[PDB]
Amino acid sequence: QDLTVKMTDLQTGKPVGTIELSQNKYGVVFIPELADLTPGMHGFHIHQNGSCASSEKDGKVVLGGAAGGHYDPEHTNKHGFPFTDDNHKGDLPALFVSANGLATNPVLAPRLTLKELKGHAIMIHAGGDNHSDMPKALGGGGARVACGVIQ
Amino acid sequence: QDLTVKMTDLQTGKPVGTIELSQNKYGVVFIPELADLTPGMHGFHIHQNGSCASSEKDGKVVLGGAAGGHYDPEHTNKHGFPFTDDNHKGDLPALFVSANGLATNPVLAPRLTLKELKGHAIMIHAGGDNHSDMPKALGGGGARVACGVIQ
Ligand SMILES: [Cu+2]
Ligand SMILES: [Cu+2]
Ligand SMILES: [Zn+2]
Ligand SMILES: [Zn+2]
């Protein structure tokens, strides 16, 4: 059981690579093979709706907005760590992008399973993720730069 | 059950911060609060001996050498991922250092427990960690830059 997800830059509309999802004894592993991203730590989460289309919010366009909020089947309404149960189950460890703009560092999500991810969108944000709604909500990820639908 | 470990730069001999270890349902969490480190991804592992003293290797001095190799109670003799069982149980996820030389991104080790860590050394390497003995052994961490004994 292994799946590959195509990731696309929402700003340019061009592909940036793929992410392989595999199931193992300790949870779901996300193995990235991305490029053309800004160096640093990027917010990385699974979102509710399976779509990367835009959305409208008070007159302004929201790239990746159709993806909705963070996957939260427990209805926790809080953003947190990948190893805490009182927050979005869609909260994954932050995504690392090297100096050359490449991301190849695999991350583990202990609270997730492969079967429940189908039909959900994988998001990559511009900012990082301190896994808290403070000082900024949703860990401070801000804008959504890359997105892909898990099918 | 929470422990704090003092980390010291092996080259300068000066402290660089602390790392808090806590036990949770999914494993051991390492919460770093370090500074004065080089930006980028650093190899991060638990070593066999509880010491950060130097060692001698074919006439050359080895900073942090007294720490021995990677914690490997299973005697796997292989270096790998934190979520694979056929490799050093001391293999942790790589440590991220921001542009300002600070490391505050918590990491999870699903295969570890707090009680077995006492008496072991926590190591931070100069290079990164691709979690494989190829192309470079021990994931390519190279020299040991920071070390601390878990007591
Ligand atoms: Cu998100
Ligand atoms: Cu090491
Ligand atoms: Zn969240
Ligand atoms: Zn190892």
UniProtKB/Swiss-Prot annotation, chains A, B:
It holds the Pfam family Sod_Cu. Keywords: Antioxidant, Copper, Disulfide bond, Metal-binding, Oxidoreductase, Periplasm, Signal, Zinc. One of its GO terms (molecular function) is copper ion binding. Its cofactor is Cu cation; Zn(2+). Cu cation binds at H45, H47, H70, H125. Disulfide bonds join C52-C147. It is found in: Periplasm. The keyword Zinc applies. PANTHER family: SUPEROXIDE DISMUTASE CU-ZN -RELATED (PTHR10003). Belongs to the Cu-Zn superoxide dismutase family. This is Superoxide dismutase [Cu-Zn]. It comes from Photobacterium leiognathi.
